[PDB]
Design an enzyme around this catalytic site. Structure first.
Site, PDB file in Angstrom:
ATOM      1  N   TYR A  49      11.722  -5.314  -5.120  1.00 39.72           N
ATOM      2  CA  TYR A  49      10.843  -5.098  -6.279  1.00 39.72           C
ATOM      3  C   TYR A  49       9.586  -4.268  -6.035  1.00 39.72           C
ATOM      4  O   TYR A  49       8.963  -3.795  -6.986  1.00 39.72           O
ATOM      5  CB  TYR A  49      10.428  -6.444  -6.875  1.00 39.72           C
ATOM      6  CG  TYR A  49       9.335  -7.107  -6.082  1.00 39.72           C
ATOM      7  CD1 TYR A  49       9.619  -7.759  -4.894  1.00 39.72           C
ATOM      8  CD2 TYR A  49       7.999  -6.996  -6.473  1.00 39.72           C
ATOM      9  CE1 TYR A  49       8.599  -8.277  -4.109  1.00 39.72           C
ATOM     10  CE2 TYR A  49       6.976  -7.507  -5.693  1.00 39.72           C
ATOM     11  CZ  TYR A  49       7.280  -8.145  -4.510  1.00 39.72           C
ATOM     12  OH  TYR A  49       6.267  -8.637  -3.721  1.00 39.72           O
TER      13      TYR A  49
ATOM     14  N   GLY B 186      -0.174  -0.508  -5.038  1.00 43.75           N
ATOM     15  CA  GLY B 186      -1.493  -1.052  -4.802  1.00 43.75           C
ATOM     16  C   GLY B 186      -2.497  -0.439  -5.750  1.00 43.75           C
ATOM     17  O   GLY B 186      -2.774   0.758  -5.668  1.00 43.75           O
TER      18      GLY B 186
ATOM     19  N   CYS C 117       0.868  -1.214   0.000  1.00 40.90           N
ATOM     20  CA  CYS C 117       0.000   0.000   0.000  1.00 40.90           C
ATOM     21  C   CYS C 117       0.877   1.227   0.000  1.00 40.90           C
ATOM     22  O   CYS C 117       2.027   1.158   0.416  1.00 40.90           O
ATOM     23  CB  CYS C 117      -0.857   0.064   1.256  1.00 40.90           C
ATOM     24  SG  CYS C 117      -1.963  -1.285   1.455  1.00 40.90           S
TER      25      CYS C 117
ATOM     26  N   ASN D 145       0.146   2.085   5.867  1.00 42.64           N
ATOM     27  CA  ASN D 145       0.767   1.029   5.090  1.00 42.64           C
ATOM     28  C   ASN D 145       1.544   0.212   6.107  1.00 42.64           C
ATOM     29  O   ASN D 145       2.411   0.731   6.810  1.00 42.64           O
ATOM     30  CB  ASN D 145       1.725   1.557   4.025  1.00 42.64           C
ATOM     31  CG  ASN D 145       2.598   0.456   3.453  1.00 42.64           C
ATOM     32  OD1 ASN D 145       3.789   0.645   3.214  1.00 42.64           O
ATOM     33  ND2 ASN D 145       2.016  -0.727   3.281  1.00 42.64           N
ATOM     34  N   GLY D 146       1.176  -1.055   6.235  1.00 43.67           N
ATOM     35  CA  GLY D 146       1.845  -1.924   7.180  1.00 43.67           C
ATOM     36  C   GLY D 146       0.833  -2.870   7.772  1.00 43.67           C
ATOM     37  O   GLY D 146      -0.336  -2.834   7.393  1.00 43.67           O
TER      38      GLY D 146
END
Ligand SMILES: Nc1ncnc2c1ncn2[C@@H]1O[C@H](COP(=O)(O)O)[C@@H](O)[C@H]1O
Lengths: 492, 492
Positions: free
Chosen positions: A258, A27, A1, A101-102
């Site tokens: 990546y 995302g 995200c 995000n996490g």
């Protein structure tokens, strides 16, 4: 995200939109933007699909205000395509909204704590909503108005003691400002920026990656430190504070592998450079270990692999040819009563340039091997194209454990590397030869760009989780979320 | 624009949908599919937008049949965004649908002929509709039903004798089959493929690029020769006939330069290999002419330029580095009341990796230069990033002339190289050095992959129009059209 947050002196909607567009690769499942208009009311717009799909003219009209945060989602366990997207919000105390995000490893606990102690109802399976509520309840412990920056830092600190896992957040609090904080371990990426408009009018911005600052003309200030909390008031003042106890930098090694754009600088490390170094290390290892075999060309598997393979080709002193072209436009496959002769799933993604494989012992380079089904087919596609020997080299070490800090990964039992040796995996995917990046190599390669970072978050490779609180009781709970997500999507 | 036609022994709607997605790069303004159902009736769905946007489940369901053609549009003169897209269809004679990639130079005259001799009204400005009515008009000369392959070919030849320009066409005639043909000069790209189902059944397909055959698992048969026509009956019989006098092979050079995909083999020439070759020619040229310049790094402008730049860097013996990253997703700018427009960005389409330009003399490599607007901003970005000397190499020669054979291009007026010298252009874009590929060299690069090709279509570079019917008068006509186009689009 990916998350973005802008506290400006002028309408922030287009900027948040543009910023998300460059974070889009973090995302594509959903996108949301929320702002605080001139009347101190939240203006929200979130839905599934790409940013371009989600936001239309009529939507941008209502997204008024000089401050807002945005989010692009990656489907996960607890937040499927069907679930509510981010950012979430509550109207009390004061009105708080947050995007993150996490992943919180003690999510279940927190949902219970919240209900029993605060009688706070969590309406979704998104740990983002839980986090917002823990934060919200902590701010509820201040009886007076307005709040002082400390209050907010107190709240944030309290929150860090309560939650566990990885997280990088940005949130807004009506009447006060915008805050952003990173987990004590600095696993999830978050950077700060500014842009001077004139004498004494700076706009601040936070985002998952530096490319969001670049694209907006924001000056990169620095990364937000592990356990640190930033707070920009409505008047444009920037405050900071260490809200964790033992902050440590254990950056997510996958971001570099990546997930992040190569033109981003995460914790003083250049993703691009780091990747090139991965090619150096792997290329060297290949020269050492695969000395006797005759490969005729190095071929990357789009996208990430391109620069890495090039580097390996250089080290091996062999030609580099673009054997696979990725189909940039992937369509929908409609279920029709009797789909006679379907198109091969793999071909949906890539196309092989026949001329590059014919009678050539090829060496394919991929960033990572997760399921292996994909890998098996890519290899198969190469043989179809006329390759005699097909060898595979992975830029990442064996992926053996699932990620529980923010990166969506299948369960341990689905990862082909889990409980298998290199030679077995090679046989399952039909590669004439398989070879992985050694973990310490990968580390040196990234660490070379910034020796200050002494330990990276790499549990997916070694099974060592920095937060220590990951167990099968928890891993199975994630699977319950995933199942409810699958029945919800299936229902649709 | 790109086209596809499948004559199958099973439903073709999903396959055509699949084909168009890999040809999406040939046109993203509008898409259209048309099939002949079990009742010998046309099933059509065409609208503005990407293929994945035009075709929803309910449309696919309607597209029933075992034979159909698809089309993705790139807006051109006469066929503006607001214009009705392709395919088009006439109810008589018999029922004919046609989809084409190219342009008719004698369109205006033809439109008059159709009206005066056949009272055939043309509702749009799209020359395809004219091509269709001409063809229809020719098929209207036959009494007996059904039509023998000979009548169709005779009709096609008659058509070839009246129209002039470049064109790869695919058409379907109810109760008969699908026909495909290529202009007598072999300008626009067209390939034939086959898929064997069993001892007695084979499906055939035509596409602008072989990548479409590749993805659907069709075996590549060959390119449709210039002036040749292909007829595939509803029973599966393939007929081929030469329908032009003195056909010659003059493949469009711009296809190899930028328009086509690297994994295609247009007229026996691998686009990839042609592109790599161009980098050799341009690298050598730079090594010769720019012998005393200090070039620290070779940085390609995504994406066409990547492999080319790689070659040049090899020749110059200079390091290749990814200094520019293309933002794979881009959104629209919004017209909101009161806000200030900042609608002047390449930054929206590209991001610069600062660390790769700092205190360096960079050699930027691009595939081509049209208006120069983009290149100016690219160079500006490189300077903003801290590059000392910014030099520019163009994989294609100077584009001084407008294309009138199917490839969209601005009027000569907007072409920066039109009426200017290299030095002058360099000054306008603010580069420290500008170098272009020599036309003869470009020809070597491509011709090297297939020496049988004598001459190519180079009008954009040399102003030599192989159809010998283009002149200032006509050029002005095309501009009056671009003015009408503008108005329709401004209107929407
Ligand atoms: N006819 C074309 N239409 C659109 N883009 C083009 C065309 N030819 C070349 N390009 C791209 O546009 C750049 C040149 O555009 P410009 O700056 O407008 O001259 C090149 O990098 C190509 O990627």
């Amino acid at each position: 995200c990916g998350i973005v947050g802008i506290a400006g002196v002028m309408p922030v909607n287009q900027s948040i939109y543009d910023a998300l567009t460059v974070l889009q690769h973090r995302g594509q499942d959903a996108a949301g933007i929320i702002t605080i208009d001139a009347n101190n009311c939240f203006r929200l717009r979130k839905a599934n699909g790409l940013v371009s799909d989600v936001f239309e003219a009529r939507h941008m009209q209502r997204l008024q205000g000089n401050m807002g945060i945005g989010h692009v989602r990656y489907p996960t366990a607890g937040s499927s395509s069907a679930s509510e997207a981010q950012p979430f919000y509550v109207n009390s105390p004061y009105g708080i909204t947050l995007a993150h995000n996490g992943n919180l490893t003690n999510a279940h606990e927190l949902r219970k704590k919240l209900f029993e102690e605060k009688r706070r109802h969590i309406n979704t399976t998104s740990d983002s909503e839980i986090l917002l509520n823990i934060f919200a309840s902590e701010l509820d412990n201040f009886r007076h108005y307005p709040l002082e920056a400390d209050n907010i830092f107190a709240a944030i600190a309290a929150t860090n003691r309560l939650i566990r896992g990885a997280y990088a957040c940005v949130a807004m609090i009506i009447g006060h400002g915008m805050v952003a904080f990173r987990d004590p371990n600095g696993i999830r990426p978050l950077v700060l920026g500014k842009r001077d408009i004139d004498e004494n009018r700076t706009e601040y911005m936070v985002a998952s990656e530096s490319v969001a600052l670049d694209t907006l003309g924001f000056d990169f200030l620095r990364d937000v430190a592990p356990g640190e909390a930033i707070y920009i008031t409505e008047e444009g003042q920037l405050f900071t504070r260490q809200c964790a106890d033992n902050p440590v930098s254990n950056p997510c090694l996958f971001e570099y592998v990546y997930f992040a754009r190569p033109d981003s600088f995460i914790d003083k490390i250049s993703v691009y450079s780091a990747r090139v170094n991965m090619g150096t290390k792997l290329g060297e290892k290949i020269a050492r270990e695969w000395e006797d075999l005759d490969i005729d060309v190095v071929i990357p598997i789009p996208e990430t692999s391109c620069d890495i393979a090039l580097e390996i080709a250089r080290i091996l002193g062999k030609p580099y040819r673009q054997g696979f072209v990725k189909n940039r436009y992937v369509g929908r496959t409609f279920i029709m009563p009797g789909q006679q002769l379907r198109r091969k799933s793999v071909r949906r993604k890539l196309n092989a340039n026949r001329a590059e494989f014919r009678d050539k012992n090829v060496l394919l380079v991929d960033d990572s091997i997760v399921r292996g089904t994909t890998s098996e087919q890519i290899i198969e596609m190469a043989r179809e194209a006329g390759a005699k020997k097909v060898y595979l080299a992975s830029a990442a070490p064996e992926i053996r454990f699932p990620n529980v800090y923010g990166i969506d990964m299948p369960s341990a039992t689905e990862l082909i590397a889990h409980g298998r040796e290199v030679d077995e995996i090679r046989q399952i995917i039909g590669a004439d030869g398989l070879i992985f990046q050694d973990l310490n190599d990968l580390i040196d390669a990234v660490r070379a760009e910034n020796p200050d970072i002494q330990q990276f978050e790499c549990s997916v490779f070694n099974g060592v989780y920095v937060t220590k609180d990951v167990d099968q009781g928890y891993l199975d709970f994630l699977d319950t979320l995933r199942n409810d997500d699958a029945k919800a999507v299936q229902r649709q």
